[PDB]
Design a protein around this nucleic acid. Structure first.
Length: 140
RNA sequence: CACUGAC
RNA sequence: GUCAGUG
């Protein structure tokens, strides 16, 4: 059969770097950042834990901390991940006003032309102890 | 994560 | 954000 899927799918926001023992788990109704780029019904997706480790010949690896990128529901022409699907490094997040349906309309952007916004949480929502904001410090 | 160069 | 390389 054929292999090699040229799928980019860049996140409009940053990721979530974890520095602890646990992975990531958001409560029902939380986990959705301030997506000013999407509509209220688009406030539903999942987090994907990715890593960037350069594979060198000598063995030199850049080594980057595990970060969970924010992906909207239906991000990928051949993702095959319905709301609720349990996958490694994949957690679903939904809020009030979001409907169950793929919305790949916001799951596309040129990463080498358009940057991403710092993933921030709304009022009454704080990040779990162990995670930090990528590109933002609590005070600076 | 630390440092540089680039879109 | 993303690519190349090094610490």
């Amino acid at each position: 059969g054929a292999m090699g899927l040229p799928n980019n799918t860049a996140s409009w926001f940053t990721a979530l770097t974890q520095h602890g023992k646990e992975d990531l788990k958001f409560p029902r109704g939380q986990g959705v950042p301030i997506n000013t780029n999407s509509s209220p019904d688009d406030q539903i997706g999942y987090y994907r834990r990715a890593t960037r480790r350069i594979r060198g010949g000598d063995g030199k690896m850049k080594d980057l901390s595990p970060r969970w990128y924010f992906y909207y529901l239906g991000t990928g022409p051949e993702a095959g991940l319905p709301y609720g699907a349990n996958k490694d490094g994949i957690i679903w997040v939904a809020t009030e006003g979001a409907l169950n349906t793929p919305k790949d309309h916001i799951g596309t952007r040129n990463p080498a032309n358009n940057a991403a916004i710092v993933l921030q949480l709304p009022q009454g929502t704080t990040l779990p102890k162990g995670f930090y904001a990528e590109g933002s410090r609590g005070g600076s």
